[PDB]
Each structure stands twice: as structure tokens, then as C-alpha cells.
Design a protein around this ligand. Structure first.
Ligand SMILES: *[C@@H]1O[C@H](CO)[C@@H](O[C@@H]2O[C@H](CO)[C@@H](O)[C@H](O)[C@H]2NC(C)=O)[C@H](O)[C@H]1NC(C)=O
Ligand SMILES: *[C@@H]1O[C@H](CO)[C@@H](O[C@@H]2O[C@H](CO)[C@@H](O)[C@H](O)[C@H]2NC(C)=O)[C@H](O)[C@H]1NC(C)=O
Ligand SMILES: *[C@@H]1O[C@H](CO)[C@@H](O[C@@H]2O[C@H](CO)[C@@H](O)[C@H](O)[C@H]2NC(C)=O)[C@H](O)[C@H]1NC(C)=O
Ligand SMILES: *[C@@H]1O[C@H](CO)[C@@H](O[C@@H]2O[C@H](CO)[C@@H](O)[C@H](O)[C@H]2NC(C)=O)[C@H](O)[C@H]1NC(C)=O
Ligand SMILES: *[C@@H]1O[C@H](CO)[C@@H](O)[C@H](O)[C@H]1NC(C)=O
Ligand SMILES: *[C@@H]1O[C@H](CO)[C@@H](O)[C@H](O)[C@H]1NC(C)=O
Ligand SMILES: *[C@@H]1O[C@H](CO)[C@@H](O)[C@H](O)[C@H]1NC(C)=O
Ligand SMILES: *[C@@H]1O[C@H](CO)[C@@H](O)[C@H](O)[C@H]1NC(C)=O
Ligand SMILES: *[C@@H]1O[C@H](CO)[C@@H](O)[C@H](O)[C@H]1NC(C)=O
Ligand SMILES: *[C@@H]1O[C@H](CO)[C@@H](O)[C@H](O)[C@H]1NC(C)=O
Ligand SMILES: *[C@@H]1O[C@H](CO)[C@@H](O)[C@H](O)[C@H]1NC(C)=O
Ligand SMILES: COc1cc(O)cc(OC)c1O
Ligand SMILES: COc1cc(O)cc(OC)c1O
Ligand SMILES: [Cl-]
Ligand SMILES: [Cl-]
Ligand SMILES: [Cu+2]
Ligand SMILES: [Cu+2]
Ligand SMILES: [Cu+2]
Ligand SMILES: [Cu+2]
Ligand SMILES: [Cu+2]
Ligand SMILES: [Cu+2]
Ligand SMILES: [Cu+2]
Ligand SMILES: [Cu+2]
Lengths: 559, 559
């Protein structure tokens, strides 16, 4: 609960708690729990928001996304997930949510937990709100969030700007007619398709039948407005802009940033950015355009102009008439100009490339299926019925090779990670790289160049040390790995558990694009409570019980 | 020679020849032969126009391009080609030059001749210029033209518009510091690289050092000028545009067309557009920009802004100052609005797909190397030491698979060809499809989408007969095959010959992307002259004899 957060002062929140408070080491005690249930059901022949009937959808409480969770900073959020799907396991991952000492509530099935069984299994997740900002939650069961298992989190708190109205979440998703497993088998041997449409907060028009409707957001004239924009796509990466208006980014993912005003923004998959918009132009209807760039290397759509309408309150109705101007091609690259409100510094001199700090990504085309993704020479392939948490608990330390375990014992230390992008391969792609348990610092990346340019860059200290940023760099949970090049990441081992680090393109992690940071194993066995350990075996026993009866194979990594 | 061709009336040419004559059935008798020699040699460590030193080049008379051939409508062109390369054969193909019953001069090694042996090998081509306009010549000995065995052709004749100055040729080319064979070798297992630079009339600035010079054309203020723009690249497809000026296309490849005024034009490898430009703007310097569109699906260059300077005679020196606006994205597609001055009509109310009219193009990844191109189940591979003409002349009619033979017996009839671009494959790229011996009709294509939009079209009678056009359609020798799509074209069988039909990207034809039209083979043998026969046999003799002493392997189609 806030006591001094007001339109005129958003930086303050409670006594001793504000925009300057280091939220990773200090949280509010509110005593308040927001409770939620997620009841999942498979719908066949469902008539989607643009007119088109889909073969099958996977639906939370029978809507297009689940419940929009809202808690305040300091609260707890508890969610009982009941899986009334026909065949599918599930497991809800809370994206952006650090899980500080609650690794078991992470929802990375095969890693932190077995999936809840179909036809009625259930499980309560509970975690603390030690961050405030905009994130979201979705299935990590192979690519099922692409079927509909997904929604948003708003955990309210201080902002790095005053604003009058919080317009609330504005999520954006690529939207395909073919269901998520059809799409996985399809991308095992074939280039990912253009999305059939892009939904904006649930809705979009069919550029071919005219059915459906635009998102319609009403600005109070002369008021400033927080809008919380997200990319919930399985694959599209997006570029966004508001015709005749600037957007001032006040946070990226769930990390508040100094005010940074811009004409457009790239959001990858899993990215979010909260922004203020000042309704100070002429009363009217303005397009909100979704565009794309980086020469389709990070997706596009058969809808050639996905859009929403921003309508000033008092102005006539109907559609915008200024088409606007195209934004700068952002080239499948996020902006590294953002600067956290709450600093971090680490040194960006000393750097040595060695096998224990380096994650080489490589598309193997010489197997079956054609498109297989490998980190440090192995495609991930978790065991759904034998998560890493059952190894931890039963004391087994011989993790399979499939598991892609990257072991980190150092306690509370900064660790630097070189992620390499198939500099050697036949070709290289944009990958949206995202970390569970943690926000990383984006120390640096290989030169910014058009995405489809085939140029290949190997980290060199002679030239690349000079390019690193150790002084309050971007901190967030999702960033771009450059086409044919390299990302230099750093994270503080401040959270024992098994924490995935993967590309967030549903087809890519599906095909092998993951690691598993085993972060501080022995500490982790101790901080896992009896209620979690016990709930872990129940769900695991039932699943293992469920699994052999299931009429369909596992046909991908599990993630 | 012309007797009435003046700036005010370009349509006339001489007594009985004019812009309306059907140059495919009627030619001037001038009795004039224009003679040329091409003395080809290997130079190692050669400093290119942009200040950068290449490992190896193959040049014609010690320059970056060979003689600029020039002649009147009617004459003969007779070029002795003396091969003073170390290791490689050569065979100079005259591209856009139909070779009316001069098939053994077409310069397709493996098809119409053996390679001219290295170390003083020698052969003289003669063909009649029964077509005026702009085209070009280059090697066909695998990818050798990527090294410098290239140049251009201007057969003077009437035009579709009056103009005061012929600015003469302006060839545009991708420019790669690596040597052709290495590039071949590379693209066998890797996406093709963006060019290191683009040369315009033979020159470019290096955009990393500034060394070199811009191409620089003077305009006589107030005058109408004709520029004969060509795309001579191994790969890049280009978009061009003149800042603050229009261009009127008065010809396409060697087909004049009715005048068509545009803002910018797309040229695929091989293509040519003569245009008219009126220096009617303010006296100044303007950038002529080469840009790319179609989402790098057919091109890119690491020079961000290849440009030349169009300088108005009388205005001052220095660089153009108005940077201008990017042309439209032409999506890797040639324009089909173009109308030949001498029209052809065929029927388009009536088509049926069959094996015998259907070219299925296929990228095959299942083998060695990674990237093999297949048309109708087979990657072409010709035999430099037994050319299909040694078959026609030995009455041997048992052609290997490899040669990708297409027997068209019909005498002087329209034949229809459905070309399919891997609608089933893992992905599909545009291809510049080039027919030897003929100009084709472009009846049509799959409809026009973004080049990387992943869309797959199969020709459909129901839907696609209303998209065809038998009423004077673009006529030309190169046109685009759409990514995942199709193309329908036609030619008359008025030329007994063996005629390659292949994608002009050096890499893809090196890879297998060809067929061979064995056009009216019975007709062919009666028509080879004693001197053509014996000369073909001589060269074949010295090639077959040279070949066992060649130190490198053939690694590619041959072509
Ligand atoms: C989870 O959900 C769907 C249930 O429909 C499964 O997807 C189907 O897989 C079958 C068997 O491989 C295919 O033949 C169907 O085409 C798929 N249909 C759709 C609509 O995707 C998937 O197999 C399931 N995975 C598991 C292990 O339960
Ligand atoms: C914003 O979205 C709008 C509406 O979807 C886009 O407007 C379309 O513009 C195209 C492009 O010329 C027109 O042919 C359509 O008729 C427009 N739709 C409407 C309803 O006006 C708009 O172009 C987007 N603007 C930008 C920069 O992408
Ligand atoms: C054509 O000429 C070039 C002349 O060098 C040959 O190219 C070389 O090929 C060898 C053998 O694979 C390589 O080691 C060299 O690196 C190549 N040099 C360059 C710069 O490309 C090529 O083999 C010749 N081809 C034939 C068929 O004789
Ligand atoms: C056309 O070509 C010029 C040739 O390089 C490009 O213009 C710029 O080059 C100047 C040299 O004057 C540089 O300062 C700029 O960085 C380049 N222009 C920019 C930033 O766009 C030019 O852009 C090309 N323009 C067109 C018409 O698309
Ligand atoms: C899930 O929703 C269904 C409606 O389809 C309802 O019948 C059922 O009781 C719900 N499950 C639970 C335990 O909430
Ligand atoms: C959007 O909603 C507002 C407020 O209720 C209304 O003024 C307007 O009619 C709507 N316009 C659109 C985008 O269709
Ligand atoms: C990559 O695997 C190698 C070789 O097996 C191992 O020595 C190395 O430390 C691994 N690196 C990472 C980053 O896990
Ligand atoms: C070819 O050019 C060379 C120099 O490169 C010259 O020596 C030679 O005489 C010329 N050869 C012929 C046959 O024209
Ligand atoms: C082409 O370059 C040549 C030099 O070989 C020059 O004489 C000519 O005028 C150039 N063409 C144009 C259009 O500038
Ligand atoms: C281009 O040539 C013209 C005509 O000779 C001259 O006026 C102009 O200064 C030249 N410009 C450059 C940059 O070389
Ligand atoms: C394609 O191949 C088949 C042989 O399977 C043949 O029947 C057909 O004539 C071929 N099509 C063309 C145009 O070559
Ligand atoms: C733009 O995205 C892709 C293009 C491709 O060509 C292949 C892929 O996966 C194997 C891709 O993801
Ligand atoms: C843009 O052109 C290509 C892209 C690719 O990714 C592979 C290729 O194989 C030849 C290509 O030609
Ligand atoms: Cl996370
Ligand atoms: Cl030709
Ligand atoms: Cu996520
Ligand atoms: Cu996550
Ligand atoms: Cu990826
Ligand atoms: Cu994840
Ligand atoms: Cu050619
Ligand atoms: Cu040709
Ligand atoms: Cu091709
Ligand atoms: Cu050819």
C-alpha cells in the first residue's frame, strides 16, 4: 500500500520506500496477498478477435489472456493453477519475477517442477513482489503460451516521472491461425512464418475481411499517461510509435530508468517498456503503429499495418487520417541508451574469453530435424518427469548433457557471460536472450549493423574492452544477441536455484536454444522448504503417473 | 549506319528501319564488321578503385572491364578472345544477344563450346547485331566473371523518345574483395555476403577510408540525356534513383518499350534499363543512389550508400548536398508495367500445368555441400570436355541427367513455362531468371508480397488465368521469380539451339540453378556450318588435352 505516491509525486511510495530505494535489497512489508486461480481449458474451432476461427486454443478462465494481476510492491501473489486441458502438461512462468529464494515457484517445467497434469491437476504458486513495474506470465510447457496460456503482471510502485493516469497494461502479440504444436513441427524444418496478425491489447482488424476492431485508447487531453506496453509474441519483434507524439520511457522490463523521450521503440519478445505520453497535441485520433525493421530478421506480419487508435477525449470518432511517418529501422536491436534509476557498476577492463565464461550458439543443420539450436554444443532437452529440482533434492549431481547445466558456485559474486552468435555458421539470426531468476547488465555487444548483413564478429579485447559499459549499463531481463555476433552479459549470483537462460523465440528454445544456470546448488537444497519440497513430489508423482497414458510424444526440448 | 536518326526524331533510323520495325524479323544490311580482341590475364595483389587490394583478378586487356563494344543495328561484331590466364578456361557469353542461328557463338561452356584453354588459348566469336540497345558480355566459366571477365555492349539504333545526348553506358556491380572461386566455395555452405562495395561506371568511394572517387556524369543543362544503366553483378540486385529527378524508361534489356516515367527503378543481376533524364532542374550536383529493398532477400552491400554525382555543366564542384528520400521498396521485383514498342500477343485465356511445362526449382540441403540448387529433381552440371554440341554433332542423343536437357522440338511455336520457386521447401529467395537465345514474354507471376514474408503460392487456374497478360507483356531476357512463388513466361521456338535457362546469381547457377533448352535439335545440326563445326572441335581438342594438366578441381556446375 502507498501513502505519498500521487499524480504530482510518483517517485515517493511509502515511508522509507521510493524510486531511489534499492528494490533488490529492500522490500515493503504490506502483509497483503493477492490471490488468483488459473483454470485452463482447450477450445476447438474458436472464433478469434479478427473473425478467423482457429483449430484449437488453450485458454485461462475462457478469455484470450489470463487475469491481469495487480499487487503493490511488498505484497505476495498466490495463484492456484488448475489444468483442465485434455492432454497437456502446464507450468506458469512469471517473467520478470526474480523468484528471490523461491526458485520452486518459477514454472520452468523440467527445471524447477514437473508440469501439473491435464484433466484437473492443480498447484499453488506463491511469490513476493520485490520488484514493481510491468511483466507477465505464460506456459513454459514447450510452446503452449502460443495457444493462449498467458497474461500480464502490474505490481504498482514508484515511477521515475510524475504522471496523471496509468492506462494499465497494453500487451502486444504476434497472432497465428495454426496452433502452437503445428507451428513447432513446422519450424523444425522450415523458416518461421510471418504472424497472421498482431493483436494489440487483445484485438486487431483482419486486413482481408475487415472484421474485428482496433485497440481504442482514450487520452484525457493535456494529461500525461503511463501506458505499459509489452511484447508477448512467440516470435515477432516489434517496433512501435504514436503518430505525432513522443513516448518517454520510464522503465524497461521491470527496472525503472531515467526519463528517456523517443519517437519509437523496439521491443523484443518478452521485453516491456513503460512510458508516459503527454496528450498535448491537437484533439484528434492518432494511429498507434506497430512496424518492423532489421530486414525481417526478427519477424513480421501478413497484416501490413497492425495498428491501434488513440483518441482524445472530446474529439470526433472514427479513424485517424494522418498515416504518419515510418520510424527509424531499429534493426532487431534494443536500445542500450536506458540508464537504471538505481545504479550498478562493475569493472569492464580485466576481461578474458575462456570456455567457462562463454556460451557459443550454433544452428546445427546436419541432423534431424533440419533446424536444431545448440548452446555450447548441445540442444537443450529437459526431463519433464525429473526436473533438475529432484536431482538437487535426491542429491544426484550427474546432470544429463541434455540439461545444459552451467554451474555457478560463487556466492553473491558478479559473473560475466559471453554469448556467441554462430559467428561460424551458414547464417546467424537475431535472438531475444532472456534470463530467469535475475536481471543482467548489458555490458556490451558487437557493432550495430543491419541485421541481415551476414557480417560476423568475434569478441576481441584489444578493440572490444573499449566498447564495454560498466557504469550504470542497461539492466533488464531480456536483450538482443546480434545477428552473427556477440553479447557480453553480467549477473550477481544473489539467488540460489536452477535458472534458465534462453532465447525467447518460442520456435528457438523449442529447438534447443537454452542453458540452465545451476546457481549455487548446495545453498539451494537448504533454502527449499518442506512445503515446496513436498508439493514438488506430489505434482511430480502425479505427472509421472499421468505421462505414459498420454497419446502424443514430446517432440522438442520441453520448453 | 543511320541516315535519319537525329535528336529531334530518334524513332527513325534509315531507309526502311525505324522504331516500329520488328528487329526480330528484319535487320539492316550494312556490310560493316566491328572487330575486337579480349586478351584475358591473371593479376595478383591488384589495387582496386576503392583503394583496396584484391588477392586476384581476371581482366580483359588489363582493365577493370573489357572493351565497351559499340556498333550499329545490322553490323557484325567479331571478337577474338585470347585466354592468357594461368589455370582457367574461359568462354565469353554475349548476354541479351539472341545469336540467331549462331548458337555455337553464345559462349556457354559445357553447352555451346568447350572452354578456351588457358596460357594463350584462342577463339573468335562472330554474331550479327539483329537487336539494338544495351546489354553486356561476361564469362560463363563457372563464376569467373566475378573476377573481372566482364564488359558491356551498345548496338546503336532508333529509340522510343527523342534525346539530345547519349551518355552511353553506366554499368552497376556488386564488388567483393574476395575472389570468385573462394566466394563460390563459401556460398556452398553459407549465406552469400553483402558486397564490400558497389562500383558505378567502374568506381566507388570506400566508405571506411574515403579513398577512390565517385562516378561523375556531366549534364548539359536543359538537355535530354540517355543513360544506359546496367546491372552487371554476380548477386546484388539494385534499386536506383536520381535525387530531385525522374527517369523515363525507353528500353528494358534489349527491348525498347513505350516511354514510362518513374521515380526509381529495380535492376536484377543481368537487367538493363535505358532511360531519359531531362536536366531541367536547378544547376547543381545530385546524388545518383543505389539503394536496396526486399529485405535483403536479393542483395546488400556494406557500403551503406553507394552513390554517383550527376553534375550540371556550369554549376560548381564538390559533393551533392541534398541527400534526398529513399525510393520505394521494390521487394526484389522487376516492374511488369513495361510495354514493348513492337508488340506480341499470345493467348492467356487457357493454361494447364504438366510435367512437361513445369520447372520446379528446389534448394536441397540434404547433401554435400549444404547449398545445392535443383531444377526438376536435378542440379545442373555440364562437362567442359563434352558440350551438348558435341552430342548434336556426334548424333549422340543420350544426354546425361546433369545437363538438365529440355527438348523443345516444335518449329517456330510459342511454348509456356511455369517456373516454381520451391513452394514446399524450407525457405525461398528471389531469383533472376535469365533465358539464353531469346527474349521471353512475362505472362505473369505469383502475386507481389514482401520478399521475406515466407508466403508460398502454387499456380491456380481458378484464380490465376485472370492475372496473366497476353496483350503486349514485358518482353526481356531477365525477370524475377518470386520468393516461395511462381513465374509464367513464353518464347517462340524461332532459334534451333542449346540455350541455358538459369538464375543469374553466380552462386546459384554455380550451385545448380539452370536448365538447358535443346531447342529444335534436328534443325540445329543442319545449320552448324563447316567452319563452326571444325572450330568447335579444335578448341575442344585443346581443352580436352589441357584439362588433365589442370592443377585445380572443377568444384561447381561448370557454369
Ligand atoms: C498438447 O496439446 C495438443 C493437443 O491437441 C497436441 O498437439 C497435437 O499433436 C498431435 C500429436 O502429435 C498432432 O497430430 C496434432 O496435429 C496436434 N494438434 C494441434 C491442434 O496442435 C500436442 O501433441 C500436445 N503435447 C503433449 C505431449 O501433450
Ligand atoms: C498506422 O496504421 C494505419 C491504419 O492501419 C496505417 O494506415 C494505412 O496506410 C496504408 C499505407 O499507405 C493505407 O493504404 C491504408 O489505407 C491505411 N489504413 C488506414 C485505415 O488509414 C498507417 O499507415 C500506419 N502508419 C505507419 C507509419 O505505418
Ligand atoms: C580458376 O582460377 C583460379 C586461379 O587461382 C583457381 O582458384 C583457386 O582454386 C584453388 C583450388 O581450389 C584454391 O586453392 C585457390 O585459393 C583459388 N584461388 C582463388 C583466388 O580463387 C580455380 O581453381 C581455377 N579453376 C579451374 C577450374 O581451373
Ligand atoms: C544517396 O547517396 C549519398 C551518397 O553517399 C547518401 O548520402 C549521405 O552521404 C553523405 C555524404 O554526403 C553522408 O553524410 C550521409 O551519412 C549519407 N546520407 C544519409 C545519412 O542518409 C544518401 O543518403 C543517399 N540518399 C538517398 C537518396 O536515399
Ligand atoms: C474450470 O472451469 C470450468 C468451466 O469450463 C468449470 O466447470 C470448473 O469447475 C473449473 N475448474 C475449477 C476447479 O475451478
Ligand atoms: C474510442 O473510444 C472513445 C471513448 O469512449 C470514443 O470517443 C471513440 O468513438 C472510439 N473511437 C474509435 C477508435 O473507433
Ligand atoms: C562448454 O563446454 C566445454 C567443453 O566441453 C566446457 O569445458 C566449457 O566450460 C563449457 N562452457 C560453458 C559456458 O558452459
Ligand atoms: C596479351 O597481353 C599481353 C600483356 O598482357 C601482351 O604481351 C600480349 O602480347 C597480348 N597477347 C596477345 C596474343 O594479344
Ligand atoms: C564511363 O566511364 C568512362 C571512362 O571509361 C567515361 O568516359 C564516361 O563518360 C563514363 N560514363 C558516364 C555516364 O559518366
Ligand atoms: C565532376 O565533373 C564536372 C565536369 O567536369 C566538374 O564540374 C565537377 O567538379 C566534378 N566533380 C567532382 C566531385 O569530381
Ligand atoms: C520434369 O521431370 C520429369 C521426369 O520426371 C519429366 O516428365 C518432365 O518433362 C520434366 N519437366 C520439364 C519441363 O523438364
Ligand atoms: C527470421 O527467422 C528465421 C529465418 C530462417 O531462415 C530460419 C530460422 O530458423 C531455423 C528463423 O528463425
Ligand atoms: C539472401 O540470399 C540468401 C540467403 C540465405 O540465407 C541463404 C542463401 O543461399 C544461397 C541465399 O542466397
Ligand atoms: Cl525471469
Ligand atoms: Cl542472352
Ligand atoms: Cu517469458
Ligand atoms: Cu522468464
Ligand atoms: Cu532465437
Ligand atoms: Cu523461460
Ligand atoms: Cu549474363
Ligand atoms: Cu545470357
Ligand atoms: Cu538464384
Ligand atoms: Cu547464362
Amino acid at each position: 500500500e502507498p501513502t505519498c505516491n500521487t499524480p504530482s509525486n510518483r517517485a515517493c511510495w511509502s515511508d522509507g520506500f521510493d524510486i531511489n530505494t534499492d528494490y533488490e535489497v529492500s522490500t515493503p512489508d504490506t502483509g497483503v496477498t493477492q490471490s488468483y486461480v488459473f483454470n485452463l481449458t482447450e477450445v476447438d474451432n474458436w472464433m478469434g478477435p479478427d473473425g478467423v476461427v482457429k483449430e484449437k486454443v488453450m485458454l485461462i478462465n475462457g478469455n484470450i489472456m489470463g487475469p491481469n494481476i495487480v499487487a503493490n510492491w511488498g505484497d505476495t501473489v498466490e495463484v492456484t493453477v488448475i489444468n483442465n486441458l485434455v492432454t497437456n502438461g502446464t507450468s506458469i512462468h512469471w517473467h520478470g519475477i526474480h523468484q528471490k529464494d523461491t526458485n520452486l515457484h518459477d514454472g520452468a517445467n523440467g527445471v524447477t517442477e514437473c508440469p501439473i497434469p491435464p484433466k484437473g491437476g492443480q498447484r499453488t504458486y506463491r511469490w513476493r513482489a520485490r520488484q514493481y513495474g510491468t511483466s507477465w506470465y505464460h506456459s513454459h510447457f514447450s510452446a503452449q503460451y502460443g495457444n493462449g496460456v498467458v497474461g500480464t503482471i502490474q505490481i504498482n510502485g514508484p515511477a521515475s516521472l510524475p504522471y496523471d493516469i496509468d492506462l494499465g497494461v497494453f500487451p502486444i502479440t504476434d497472432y497465428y491461425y495454426r496452433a502452437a504444436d503445428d507451428l513447432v513441427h513446422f519450424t523444425q524444418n522450415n523458416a518461421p512464418p510471418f504472424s497472421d496478425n498482431v493483436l494489440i491489447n487483445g484485438t486487431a482488424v483482419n486486413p482481408n475481411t475487415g472484421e474485428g476492431q482496433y485497440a481504442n485508447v482514450t487520452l484525457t487531453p493535456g494529461k500525461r499517461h503511463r501506458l505499459r506496453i509489452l511484447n508477448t509474441s512467440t516470435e515477432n519483434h516489434f517496433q512501435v510509435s504514436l503518430v505525432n507524439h513522443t513516448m518517454t520511457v520510464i522503465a524497461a522490463d521491470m527496472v525503472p530508468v531515467n526519463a528517456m523521450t523517443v519517437d519509437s521503440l523496439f521491443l523484443a519478445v518478452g521485453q516491456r517498456y513503460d512510458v508516459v505520453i503527454d496528450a498535448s497535441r491537437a484533439p484528434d485520433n492518432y494511429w498507434f503503429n506497430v512496424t518492423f525493421g532489421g530486414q525481417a530478421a526478427c519477424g513480421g506480419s501478413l497484416n501490413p499495418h497492425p495498428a491501434a487508435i488513440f483518441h482524445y477525449a472530446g474529439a470526433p470518432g472514427g479513424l485517424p487520417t494522418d498515416e504518419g511517418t515510418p520510424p527509424v529501422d531499429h534493426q532487431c536491436l534494443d536500445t542500450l541508451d536506458v540508464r537504471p534509476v538505481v545504479p550498478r557498476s562493475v569493472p569492464v577492463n580485466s576481461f578474458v574469453k575462456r570456455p567457462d565464461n562463454t556460451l557459443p550458439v550454433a544452428l546445427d543443420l546436419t541432423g534431424t530435424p533440419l533446424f536444431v539450436w545448440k548452446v555450447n554444443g548441445s540442444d537443450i532437452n529437459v526431463d519433464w518427469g525429473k526436473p533438475i529440482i529432484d536431482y538437487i533434492l535426491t542429491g544426484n549431481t550427474s546432470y544429463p548433457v541434455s540439461d545444459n547445466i552451467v554451474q555457478v558456485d560463487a556466492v553473491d559474486q558478479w559473473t560475466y557471460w559471453l554469448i556467441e552468435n554462430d559467428p561460424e555458421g551458414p547464417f546467424s539470426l537475431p535472438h531475444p536472450m532472456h534470463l530467469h531468476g535475475h536481471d543482467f547488465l548489458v555490458l556490451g555487444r558487437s557493432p550495430d549493423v543491419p541485421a541481415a548483413s551476414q557480417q560476423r564478429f568475434v569478441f576481441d579485447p584489444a578493440v572490444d574492452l573499449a566498447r564495454l559499459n560498466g557504469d550504470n549499463p542497461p539492466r533488464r531481463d531480456t536483450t538482443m544477441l546480434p545477428a552473427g555476433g556477440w553479447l557480453l552479459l553480467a549477473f550477481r549470483t544473489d539467488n540460489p536455484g536452477a535458472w534458465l537462460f534462453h532465447c525467447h523465440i518460442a520456435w528457438h528454445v523449442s529447438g534447443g536454444l537454452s542453458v540452465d544456470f545451476l546457481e549455487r546448488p548446495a545453498d539451494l537444497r537448504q533454502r527449499i522448504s518442506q512445503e515446496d519440497e513436498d508439493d514438488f513430489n506430489r505434482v511430480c508423482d502425479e505427472w509421472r503417473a499421468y505421462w505414459p497414458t498420454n497419446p502424443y510424444p514430446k517432440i522438442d526440448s520441453g520448453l
